[PDB]
PDB file of C-alpha atoms in Angstrom:
ATOM      1  CA  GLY H   2      76.337 -50.246  33.670  1.00  0.00           C
ATOM      2  CA  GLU H   3      73.033 -52.153  33.324  1.00  0.00           C
ATOM      3  CA  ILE H   4      74.460 -55.644  34.223  1.00  0.00           C
ATOM      4  CA  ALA H   5      76.203 -54.304  37.388  1.00  0.00           C
ATOM      5  CA  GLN H   6      72.934 -52.474  38.333  1.00  0.00           C
ATOM      6  CA  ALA H   7      70.890 -55.705  37.852  1.00  0.00           C
ATOM      7  CA  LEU H   8      73.409 -57.693  39.994  1.00  0.00           C
ATOM      8  CA  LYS H   9      73.036 -54.978  42.703  1.00  0.00           C
ATOM      9  CA  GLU H  10      69.204 -55.539  42.536  1.00  0.00           C
ATOM     10  CA  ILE H  11      69.873 -59.289  43.128  1.00  0.00           C
ATOM     11  CA  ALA H  12      72.039 -58.347  46.191  1.00  0.00           C
ATOM     12  CA  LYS H  13      69.236 -56.075  47.529  1.00  0.00           C
ATOM     13  CA  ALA H  14      66.685 -58.932  47.101  1.00  0.00           C
ATOM     14  CA  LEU H  15      69.014 -61.357  48.984  1.00  0.00           C
ATOM     15  CA  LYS H  16      69.224 -58.748  51.814  1.00  0.00           C
ATOM     16  CA  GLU H  17      65.361 -58.764  51.871  1.00  0.00           C
ATOM     17  CA  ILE H  18      65.570 -62.588  52.338  1.00  0.00           C
ATOM     18  CA  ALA H  19      68.023 -62.063  55.283  1.00  0.00           C
ATOM     19  CA  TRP H  20      65.598 -59.502  56.863  1.00  0.00           C
ATOM     20  CA  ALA H  21      62.683 -62.023  56.534  1.00  0.00           C
ATOM     21  CA  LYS H  22      64.833 -64.785  58.171  1.00  0.00           C
ATOM     22  CA  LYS H  23      65.591 -62.359  61.082  1.00  0.00           C
ATOM     23  CA  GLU H  24      61.778 -61.964  61.486  1.00  0.00           C
ATOM     24  CA  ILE H  25      61.525 -65.810  61.644  1.00  0.00           C
ATOM     25  CA  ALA H  26      64.219 -65.856  64.437  1.00  0.00           C
ATOM     26  CA  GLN H  27      62.246 -63.175  66.405  1.00  0.00           C
ATOM     27  CA  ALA H  28      58.959 -65.157  65.931  1.00  0.00           C
ATOM     28  CA  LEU H  29      60.639 -68.355  67.306  1.00  0.00           C
ATOM     29  CA  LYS H  30      62.194 -66.406  70.296  1.00  0.00           C
ATOM     30  CA  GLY H  31      58.631 -65.145  71.065  1.00  0.00           C
TER      31      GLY H  31
ATOM     32  CA  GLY P   2      69.367 -55.100  27.291  1.00  0.00           C
ATOM     33  CA  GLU P   3      67.895 -58.637  27.457  1.00  0.00           C
ATOM     34  CA  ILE P   4      70.506 -60.078  29.937  1.00  0.00           C
ATOM     35  CA  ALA P   5      70.061 -57.125  32.372  1.00  0.00           C
ATOM     36  CA  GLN P   6      66.228 -57.526  32.058  1.00  0.00           C
ATOM     37  CA  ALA P   7      66.489 -61.296  32.829  1.00  0.00           C
ATOM     38  CA  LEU P   8      68.743 -60.585  35.882  1.00  0.00           C
ATOM     39  CA  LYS P   9      66.098 -58.046  37.076  1.00  0.00           C
ATOM     40  CA  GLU P  10      63.461 -60.873  36.755  1.00  0.00           C
ATOM     41  CA  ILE P  11      65.729 -63.046  38.993  1.00  0.00           C
ATOM     42  CA  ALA P  12      65.849 -60.147  41.547  1.00  0.00           C
ATOM     43  CA  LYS P  13      62.010 -59.835  41.443  1.00  0.00           C
ATOM     44  CA  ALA P  14      61.661 -63.627  42.036  1.00  0.00           C
ATOM     45  CA  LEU P  15      64.083 -63.429  45.029  1.00  0.00           C
ATOM     46  CA  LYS P  16      61.899 -60.579  46.438  1.00  0.00           C
ATOM     47  CA  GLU P  17      58.889 -62.975  46.092  1.00  0.00           C
ATOM     48  CA  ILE P  18      60.884 -65.521  48.188  1.00  0.00           C
ATOM     49  CA  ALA P  19      61.532 -62.784  50.851  1.00  0.00           C
ATOM     50  CA  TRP P  20      57.768 -61.935  50.934  1.00  0.00           C
ATOM     51  CA  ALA P  21      56.905 -65.671  51.424  1.00  0.00           C
ATOM     52  CA  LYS P  22      59.474 -65.920  54.304  1.00  0.00           C
ATOM     53  CA  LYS P  23      57.817 -62.832  55.944  1.00  0.00           C
ATOM     54  CA  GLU P  24      54.494 -64.772  55.743  1.00  0.00           C
ATOM     55  CA  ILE P  25      56.248 -67.731  57.489  1.00  0.00           C
ATOM     56  CA  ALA P  26      57.383 -65.325  60.313  1.00  0.00           C
ATOM     57  CA  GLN P  27      53.743 -64.079  60.705  1.00  0.00           C
ATOM     58  CA  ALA P  28      52.461 -67.741  60.741  1.00  0.00           C
ATOM     59  CA  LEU P  29      54.984 -68.663  63.527  1.00  0.00           C
ATOM     60  CA  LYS P  30      54.055 -65.488  65.578  1.00  0.00           C
ATOM     61  CA  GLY P  31      50.382 -66.636  65.296  1.00  0.00           C
TER      62      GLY P  31
ATOM     63  CA  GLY D   2      68.653 -64.782  22.938  1.00  0.00           C
ATOM     64  CA  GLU D   3      69.281 -68.241  24.464  1.00  0.00           C
ATOM     65  CA  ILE D   4      71.217 -67.007  27.589  1.00  0.00           C
ATOM     66  CA  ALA D   5      68.518 -64.395  28.437  1.00  0.00           C
ATOM     67  CA  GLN D   6      65.819 -67.115  27.925  1.00  0.00           C
ATOM     68  CA  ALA D   7      67.702 -69.532  30.261  1.00  0.00           C
ATOM     69  CA  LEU D   8      68.050 -66.765  32.928  1.00  0.00           C
ATOM     70  CA  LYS D   9      64.256 -66.169  32.615  1.00  0.00           C
ATOM     71  CA  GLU D  10      63.758 -69.958  33.275  1.00  0.00           C
ATOM     72  CA  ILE D  11      65.885 -69.545  36.462  1.00  0.00           C
ATOM     73  CA  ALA D  12      63.615 -66.598  37.514  1.00  0.00           C
ATOM     74  CA  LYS D  13      60.476 -68.731  36.871  1.00  0.00           C
ATOM     75  CA  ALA D  14      61.949 -71.589  38.998  1.00  0.00           C
ATOM     76  CA  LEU D  15      62.719 -69.120  41.856  1.00  0.00           C
ATOM     77  CA  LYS D  16      59.055 -67.938  41.649  1.00  0.00           C
ATOM     78  CA  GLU D  17      58.031 -71.641  42.039  1.00  0.00           C
ATOM     79  CA  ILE D  18      60.185 -71.708  45.240  1.00  0.00           C
ATOM     80  CA  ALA D  19      58.338 -68.557  46.514  1.00  0.00           C
ATOM     81  CA  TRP D  20      54.937 -70.235  45.768  1.00  0.00           C
ATOM     82  CA  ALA D  21      56.029 -73.385  47.732  1.00  0.00           C
ATOM     83  CA  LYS D  22      57.140 -71.189  50.710  1.00  0.00           C
ATOM     84  CA  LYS D  23      53.676 -69.478  50.644  1.00  0.00           C
ATOM     85  CA  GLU D  24      52.151 -73.006  50.929  1.00  0.00           C
ATOM     86  CA  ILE D  25      54.415 -73.600  53.996  1.00  0.00           C
ATOM     87  CA  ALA D  26      53.105 -70.308  55.581  1.00  0.00           C
ATOM     88  CA  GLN D  27      49.460 -71.439  54.950  1.00  0.00           C
ATOM     89  CA  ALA D  28      50.215 -74.922  56.448  1.00  0.00           C
ATOM     90  CA  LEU D  29      51.671 -73.283  59.632  1.00  0.00           C
ATOM     91  CA  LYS D  30      48.657 -70.837  59.905  1.00  0.00           C
ATOM     92  CA  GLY D  31      46.375 -73.943  59.729  1.00  0.00           C
TER      93      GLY D  31
ATOM     94  CA  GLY Y   2      74.611 -73.596  23.189  1.00  0.00           C
ATOM     95  CA  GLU Y   3      76.358 -75.331  26.127  1.00  0.00           C
ATOM     96  CA  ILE Y   4      76.140 -72.334  28.579  1.00  0.00           C
ATOM     97  CA  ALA Y   5      72.377 -71.853  27.920  1.00  0.00           C
ATOM     98  CA  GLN Y   6      71.879 -75.663  28.359  1.00  0.00           C
ATOM     99  CA  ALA Y   7      73.782 -75.596  31.712  1.00  0.00           C
ATOM    100  CA  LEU Y   8      71.690 -72.584  32.921  1.00  0.00           C
ATOM    101  CA  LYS Y   9      68.526 -74.574  31.972  1.00  0.00           C
ATOM    102  CA  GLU Y  10      69.877 -77.478  34.158  1.00  0.00           C
ATOM    103  CA  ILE Y  11      70.217 -74.954  37.050  1.00  0.00           C
ATOM    104  CA  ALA Y  12      66.547 -73.904  36.462  1.00  0.00           C
ATOM    105  CA  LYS Y  13      65.441 -77.595  36.483  1.00  0.00           C
ATOM    106  CA  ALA Y  14      67.337 -78.168  39.791  1.00  0.00           C
ATOM    107  CA  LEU Y  15      65.649 -75.069  41.342  1.00  0.00           C
ATOM    108  CA  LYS Y  16      62.253 -76.535  40.251  1.00  0.00           C
ATOM    109  CA  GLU Y  17      63.255 -79.759  42.123  1.00  0.00           C
ATOM    110  CA  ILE Y  18      63.865 -77.569  45.233  1.00  0.00           C
ATOM    111  CA  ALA Y  19      60.356 -75.996  44.791  1.00  0.00           C
ATOM    112  CA  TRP Y  20      58.782 -79.504  44.525  1.00  0.00           C
ATOM    113  CA  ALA Y  21      60.580 -80.596  47.766  1.00  0.00           C
ATOM    114  CA  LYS Y  22      59.312 -77.425  49.577  1.00  0.00           C
ATOM    115  CA  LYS Y  23      55.725 -78.278  48.406  1.00  0.00           C
ATOM    116  CA  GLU Y  24      56.235 -81.729  50.043  1.00  0.00           C
ATOM    117  CA  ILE Y  25      57.303 -79.910  53.272  1.00  0.00           C
ATOM    118  CA  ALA Y  26      54.017 -77.849  53.130  1.00  0.00           C
ATOM    119  CA  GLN Y  27      51.987 -81.116  52.740  1.00  0.00           C
ATOM    120  CA  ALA Y  28      53.947 -82.722  55.675  1.00  0.00           C
ATOM    121  CA  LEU Y  29      53.172 -79.685  57.944  1.00  0.00           C
ATOM    122  CA  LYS Y  30      49.424 -79.716  56.901  1.00  0.00           C
ATOM    123  CA  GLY Y  31      49.386 -83.440  57.911  1.00  0.00           C
TER     124      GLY Y  31
ATOM    125  CA  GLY I   2      83.714 -76.341  27.877  1.00  0.00           C
ATOM    126  CA  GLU I   3      84.984 -75.748  31.447  1.00  0.00           C
ATOM    127  CA  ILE I   4      82.431 -72.960  32.322  1.00  0.00           C
ATOM    128  CA  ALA I   5      79.454 -75.083  31.108  1.00  0.00           C
ATOM    129  CA  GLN I   6      80.875 -78.085  33.091  1.00  0.00           C
ATOM    130  CA  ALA I   7      81.199 -75.927  36.271  1.00  0.00           C
ATOM    131  CA  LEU I   8      77.589 -74.640  35.836  1.00  0.00           C
ATOM    132  CA  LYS I   9      76.462 -78.310  35.503  1.00  0.00           C
ATOM    133  CA  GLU I  10      78.266 -79.017  38.863  1.00  0.00           C
ATOM    134  CA  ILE I  11      76.231 -76.126  40.397  1.00  0.00           C
ATOM    135  CA  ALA I  12      73.007 -77.743  39.016  1.00  0.00           C
ATOM    136  CA  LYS I  13      74.023 -81.146  40.498  1.00  0.00           C
ATOM    137  CA  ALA I  14      74.679 -79.491  43.914  1.00  0.00           C
ATOM    138  CA  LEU I  15      71.232 -77.772  43.801  1.00  0.00           C
ATOM    139  CA  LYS I  16      69.676 -81.225  43.075  1.00  0.00           C
ATOM    140  CA  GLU I  17      71.496 -82.507  46.232  1.00  0.00           C
ATOM    141  CA  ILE I  18      69.779 -79.643  48.158  1.00  0.00           C
ATOM    142  CA  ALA I  19      66.365 -80.762  46.724  1.00  0.00           C
ATOM    143  CA  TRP I  20      67.089 -84.398  47.818  1.00  0.00           C
ATOM    144  CA  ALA I  21      67.958 -83.178  51.386  1.00  0.00           C
ATOM    145  CA  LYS I  22      64.686 -81.127  51.520  1.00  0.00           C
ATOM    146  CA  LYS I  23      62.746 -84.298  50.469  1.00  0.00           C
ATOM    147  CA  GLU I  24      64.397 -86.064  53.472  1.00  0.00           C
ATOM    148  CA  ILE I  25      63.135 -83.176  55.697  1.00  0.00           C
ATOM    149  CA  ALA I  26      59.548 -83.703  54.310  1.00  0.00           C
ATOM    150  CA  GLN I  27      59.787 -87.486  55.083  1.00  0.00           C
ATOM    151  CA  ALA I  28      61.116 -86.738  58.636  1.00  0.00           C
ATOM    152  CA  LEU I  29      58.137 -84.362  59.295  1.00  0.00           C
ATOM    153  CA  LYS I  30      55.598 -86.945  57.865  1.00  0.00           C
ATOM    154  CA  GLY I  31      57.120 -89.498  60.325  1.00  0.00           C
TER     155      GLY I  31
ATOM    156  CA  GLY K   2      90.698 -71.502  34.269  1.00  0.00           C
ATOM    157  CA  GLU K   3      90.120 -69.262  37.325  1.00  0.00           C
ATOM    158  CA  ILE K   4      86.376 -68.539  36.621  1.00  0.00           C
ATOM    159  CA  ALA K   5      85.570 -72.274  36.157  1.00  0.00           C
ATOM    160  CA  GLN K   6      87.551 -73.040  39.388  1.00  0.00           C
ATOM    161  CA  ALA K   7      85.574 -70.355  41.323  1.00  0.00           C
ATOM    162  CA  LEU K   8      82.234 -71.751  39.980  1.00  0.00           C
ATOM    163  CA  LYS K   9      83.378 -75.242  41.156  1.00  0.00           C
ATOM    164  CA  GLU K  10      83.987 -73.699  44.659  1.00  0.00           C
ATOM    165  CA  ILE K  11      80.368 -72.382  44.557  1.00  0.00           C
ATOM    166  CA  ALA K  12      79.176 -75.953  43.685  1.00  0.00           C
ATOM    167  CA  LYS K  13      81.229 -77.406  46.605  1.00  0.00           C
ATOM    168  CA  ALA K  14      79.682 -74.810  49.000  1.00  0.00           C
ATOM    169  CA  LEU K  15      76.140 -75.713  47.771  1.00  0.00           C
ATOM    170  CA  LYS K  16      76.989 -79.410  48.477  1.00  0.00           C
ATOM    171  CA  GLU K  17      77.949 -78.312  52.051  1.00  0.00           C
ATOM    172  CA  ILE K  18      74.452 -76.716  52.318  1.00  0.00           C
ATOM    173  CA  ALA K  19      72.862 -80.038  51.130  1.00  0.00           C
ATOM    174  CA  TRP K  20      74.892 -81.985  53.773  1.00  0.00           C
ATOM    175  CA  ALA K  21      73.702 -79.548  56.530  1.00  0.00           C
ATOM    176  CA  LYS K  22      70.038 -79.989  55.384  1.00  0.00           C
ATOM    177  CA  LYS K  23      70.517 -83.822  55.600  1.00  0.00           C
ATOM    178  CA  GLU K  24      71.665 -83.263  59.234  1.00  0.00           C
ATOM    179  CA  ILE K  25      68.432 -81.249  59.821  1.00  0.00           C
ATOM    180  CA  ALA K  26      66.379 -84.242  58.442  1.00  0.00           C
ATOM    181  CA  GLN K  27      68.231 -86.620  60.865  1.00  0.00           C
ATOM    182  CA  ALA K  28      67.623 -84.158  63.795  1.00  0.00           C
ATOM    183  CA  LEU K  29      63.839 -84.037  62.991  1.00  0.00           C
ATOM    184  CA  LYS K  30      63.664 -87.912  62.681  1.00  0.00           C
ATOM    185  CA  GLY K  31      65.296 -88.060  66.174  1.00  0.00           C
TER     186      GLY K  31
ATOM    187  CA  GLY C   2      91.400 -61.803  38.605  1.00  0.00           C
ATOM    188  CA  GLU C   3      88.734 -59.642  40.312  1.00  0.00           C
ATOM    189  CA  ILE C   4      85.665 -61.597  38.973  1.00  0.00           C
ATOM    190  CA  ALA C   5      87.143 -64.986  40.056  1.00  0.00           C
ATOM    191  CA  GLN C   6      87.983 -63.446  43.499  1.00  0.00           C
ATOM    192  CA  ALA C   7      84.383 -62.112  43.868  1.00  0.00           C
ATOM    193  CA  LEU C   8      82.942 -65.557  42.906  1.00  0.00           C
ATOM    194  CA  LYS C   9      85.226 -67.113  45.590  1.00  0.00           C
ATOM    195  CA  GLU C  10      83.709 -64.607  48.128  1.00  0.00           C
ATOM    196  CA  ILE C  11      80.226 -65.876  47.075  1.00  0.00           C
ATOM    197  CA  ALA C  12      81.437 -69.492  47.703  1.00  0.00           C
ATOM    198  CA  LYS C  13      82.779 -68.489  51.164  1.00  0.00           C
ATOM    199  CA  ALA C  14      79.404 -66.843  52.022  1.00  0.00           C
ATOM    200  CA  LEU C  15      77.518 -70.022  50.928  1.00  0.00           C
ATOM    201  CA  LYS C  16      79.852 -72.047  53.237  1.00  0.00           C
ATOM    202  CA  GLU C  17      78.824 -69.635  56.076  1.00  0.00           C
ATOM    203  CA  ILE C  18      75.161 -70.518  55.259  1.00  0.00           C
ATOM    204  CA  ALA C  19      76.045 -74.277  55.490  1.00  0.00           C
ATOM    205  CA  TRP C  20      77.746 -73.677  58.909  1.00  0.00           C
ATOM    206  CA  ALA C  21      74.598 -71.824  60.184  1.00  0.00           C
ATOM    207  CA  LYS C  22      72.363 -74.736  58.977  1.00  0.00           C
ATOM    208  CA  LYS C  23      74.654 -77.190  60.891  1.00  0.00           C
ATOM    209  CA  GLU C  24      74.012 -75.029  64.020  1.00  0.00           C
ATOM    210  CA  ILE C  25      70.233 -75.398  63.342  1.00  0.00           C
ATOM    211  CA  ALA C  26      70.665 -79.252  63.157  1.00  0.00           C
ATOM    212  CA  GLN C  27      72.572 -79.216  66.521  1.00  0.00           C
ATOM    213  CA  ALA C  28      69.853 -76.978  68.114  1.00  0.00           C
ATOM    214  CA  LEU C  29      67.098 -79.440  66.971  1.00  0.00           C
ATOM    215  CA  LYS C  30      69.135 -82.503  68.242  1.00  0.00           C
ATOM    216  CA  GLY C  31      69.364 -80.687  71.638  1.00  0.00           C
TER     217      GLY C  31
ATOM    218  CA  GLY T   2      85.455 -53.000  38.366  1.00  0.00           C
ATOM    219  CA  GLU T   3      81.658 -52.578  38.646  1.00  0.00           C
ATOM    220  CA  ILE T   4      80.731 -56.284  37.981  1.00  0.00           C
ATOM    221  CA  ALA T   5      83.255 -57.554  40.600  1.00  0.00           C
ATOM    222  CA  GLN T   6      81.903 -54.909  43.079  1.00  0.00           C
ATOM    223  CA  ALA T   7      78.281 -56.060  42.444  1.00  0.00           C
ATOM    224  CA  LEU T   8      79.293 -59.752  42.938  1.00  0.00           C
ATOM    225  CA  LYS T   9      80.957 -58.713  46.260  1.00  0.00           C
ATOM    226  CA  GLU T  10      77.583 -57.089  47.266  1.00  0.00           C
ATOM    227  CA  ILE T  11      75.889 -60.466  46.506  1.00  0.00           C
ATOM    228  CA  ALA T  12      78.491 -62.195  48.774  1.00  0.00           C
ATOM    229  CA  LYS T  13      77.815 -59.644  51.577  1.00  0.00           C
ATOM    230  CA  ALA T  14      74.023 -60.265  51.253  1.00  0.00           C
ATOM    231  CA  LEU T  15      74.584 -64.076  51.457  1.00  0.00           C
ATOM    232  CA  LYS T  16      76.640 -63.467  54.662  1.00  0.00           C
ATOM    233  CA  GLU T  17      73.588 -61.534  56.025  1.00  0.00           C
ATOM    234  CA  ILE T  18      71.472 -64.663  55.270  1.00  0.00           C
ATOM    235  CA  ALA T  19      74.042 -66.836  57.185  1.00  0.00           C
ATOM    236  CA  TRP T  20      73.887 -64.423  60.190  1.00  0.00           C
ATOM    237  CA  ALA T  21      70.028 -64.626  60.195  1.00  0.00           C
ATOM    238  CA  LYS T  22      70.201 -68.488  60.102  1.00  0.00           C
ATOM    239  CA  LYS T  23      72.609 -68.378  63.126  1.00  0.00           C
ATOM    240  CA  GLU T  24      69.908 -66.305  64.930  1.00  0.00           C
ATOM    241  CA  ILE T  25      67.361 -69.058  64.033  1.00  0.00           C
ATOM    242  CA  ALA T  26      69.734 -71.689  65.613  1.00  0.00           C
ATOM    243  CA  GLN T  27      69.964 -69.542  68.822  1.00  0.00           C
ATOM    244  CA  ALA T  28      66.110 -69.132  68.867  1.00  0.00           C
ATOM    245  CA  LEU T  29      65.630 -72.960  68.578  1.00  0.00           C
ATOM    246  CA  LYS T  30      68.277 -73.616  71.355  1.00  0.00           C
ATOM    247  CA  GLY T  31      66.261 -71.178  73.565  1.00  0.00           C
TER     248      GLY T  31
END
């Protein structure tokens, strides 16, 4: 359904935020 | 539908937050 | 509809958060 | 309606978060 | 209604996050 | 109701995030 | 119900974010 | 159901954000 699919797009975008935060951790460790 | 479309706009805005965080990682690495 | 319009206001506010984070990246690069 | 009004209050609170992040950018630039 | 009231509690909590971020800006300016 | 109660748990968790950010402000001031 | 249970999982995940932020405060204080 | 499953995916993505923040704490402690 379209609402479930849109909520899954929100989850994917939150995962993109997590990936960006991991890049911040690696930048600080460097 | 309009609710699904609005939830997709929320997902797009969260992706914009992820892109900004990636720019923060690049700024710290520099 | 009013709920879709309110969800679009949430998306616009999240975009404002992304814009503020981009300003943080530019401040760090400077 | 009451649900739309409450979602608009969430959007206003997210805008307050964006404004605070802009203040963080100005603090880092200083 | 109870759902609208709970969404208003979420908005109040997000405002508390904005207030905490403002304290971070003041700490950096100091 | 159970949905309102779960949304109130989300609000309480967001308040925990605000409290943690206040601790970050105190750490930076120190 | 399944939606209430899923919203409670979101609250638990937000509490995990608060715990991680508390670890950031302790790292800065050190 | 599909909406509950999508909300559980949002919770999992928020847990990924918490894990990334824990990595930021470890980077700062180092």
